[PDB]
Amino acid sequence: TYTTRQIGAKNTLEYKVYIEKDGKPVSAFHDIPLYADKENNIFNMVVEIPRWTNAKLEITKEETLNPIIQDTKKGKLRFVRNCFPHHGYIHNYGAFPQTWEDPNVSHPETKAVGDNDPIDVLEIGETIAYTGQVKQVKALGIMALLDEGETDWKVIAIDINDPLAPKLNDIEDVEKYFPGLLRATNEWFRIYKIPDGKPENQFAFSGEAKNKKYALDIIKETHDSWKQLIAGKSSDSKGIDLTNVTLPDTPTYSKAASDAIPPASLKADAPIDKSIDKWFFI
Amino acid sequence: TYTTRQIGAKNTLEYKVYIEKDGKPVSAFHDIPLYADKENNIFNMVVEIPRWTNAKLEITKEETLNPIIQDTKKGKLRFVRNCFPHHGYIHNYGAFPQTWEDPNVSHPETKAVGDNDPIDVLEIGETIAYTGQVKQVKALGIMALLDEGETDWKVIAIDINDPLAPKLNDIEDVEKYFPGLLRATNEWFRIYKIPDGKPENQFAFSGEAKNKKYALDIIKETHDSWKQLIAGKSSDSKGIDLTNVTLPDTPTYSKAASDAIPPASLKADAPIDKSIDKWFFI
């Protein structure tokens, strides 16, 4: 069973969320299996950001056991702005562990290098998830986002426990049960950084959402890039901390890393500056 | 100075918010002056529901001093559902005190009786308001909503402290600085109750937002209806509690009413059922 270990208050620089496997901290990047049920195409998704929130939380590549922490820009805590008609993130957002968008190679389909991070997942179920939650989802499709010129695929998925899950089997079903969502998803990733002064992003395939099979191929591909990385065979690992406690066959395996993680110190959320309330009409 | 006296925890049946004037509870319906600046037409708006929230809090007509209490449905707290692409309410929502949508007569403009409540206000500023907040706003326009067949005007307004207030002077400026807000406003009020089993709402004037001049005229007439009501001259007050502590000339004036209100008993917000998370595509 996976649980979370929180250090500090949310919305502070000291906030860290470690994922625990049976009470013991494990690497959120390397120790959680990508597949919950391989042949049935059920995956383990690590949730970073709950729907309708702004704090840009992410699994950190540079710290041991890769806790989830808030991203920073110029020494300041990072928050995504509200762009009409959306309120913060419009999906439960996270990544698939044991995957890597290889920055060392130009990807053929997008003609750009990867963004140096596990592949991204948009979970569309009704329930709002929590930071550090490990959930089982099934893939429905995938969108080729070129984020600031880098390959940054967005997998469309759904918690297997969602009431609609059995009725969603491929990308065509998303438009059927969630009309307008794919259109709103394309728009969201194109414009979410404009309030920060960044240019609009673009999508390959004219923003088309590829089907489940295509999505599976990309996922497995990024999983193989991770296999190379964790074996220590990448030409450039970019300072990613490869410490893990469940892969004894790897050179960075260390059972003792778990014991070095500090105990939980869950404190009440810190306040967020009122400027984050603002709705941008871009 | 207007402050708030909170009884209980937010999101519970016992939650009440009384508005205080210099430390003394006053009627949120009758004792708060409609105009903050009559010559400049600056109005006092009582905030019921903050933007992006769901609890349907309202000024209560039947309780002494008319505190803000959450509406209920079948013994349970009433929450408005999230209808794609909106999250809860898309405006800071409230009312103008000392106004009344008269249910005893059919309004010439819409040919329907009033909904028996203070006229409604949509405040479009960037900052998220708080329940029980008395804010000064300028009127920009008005929409003729026929809610379940009753005259239910919606005044469009903005906090005079908003950074864009100087630039917004009439209805046309809303589309100029908040493109799409009006269309979204039209859609929100048409569909927000479909998930509750209600039929879609309608708008007179083809759902067009009338200008400031027009709005001022309607507010004036609802203010005159209230003047009749508070005087005890309405043919039927529908059981509304007309107790007030600032209008000596009225038969229901009673200064001791402030003293009967118990002291503030603020508690931390109570959790909201996860079912409220659900996004409806209707």
Ligand SMILES: [Mn+2]
């Ligand atoms: Mn990032």
Ligand SMILES: [Mn+2]
């Ligand atoms: Mn990511």
Ligand SMILES: [Mn+2]
């Ligand atoms: Mn990105």
Ligand SMILES: [Mn+2]
């Ligand atoms: Mn990414």
Ligand SMILES: [Mn+2]
């Ligand atoms: Mn009502």
Ligand SMILES: [Mn+2]
């Ligand atoms: Mn109202």
Ligand SMILES: [Mn+2]
């Ligand atoms: Mn109504």
Ligand SMILES: [Mn+2]
């Ligand atoms: Mn009303």
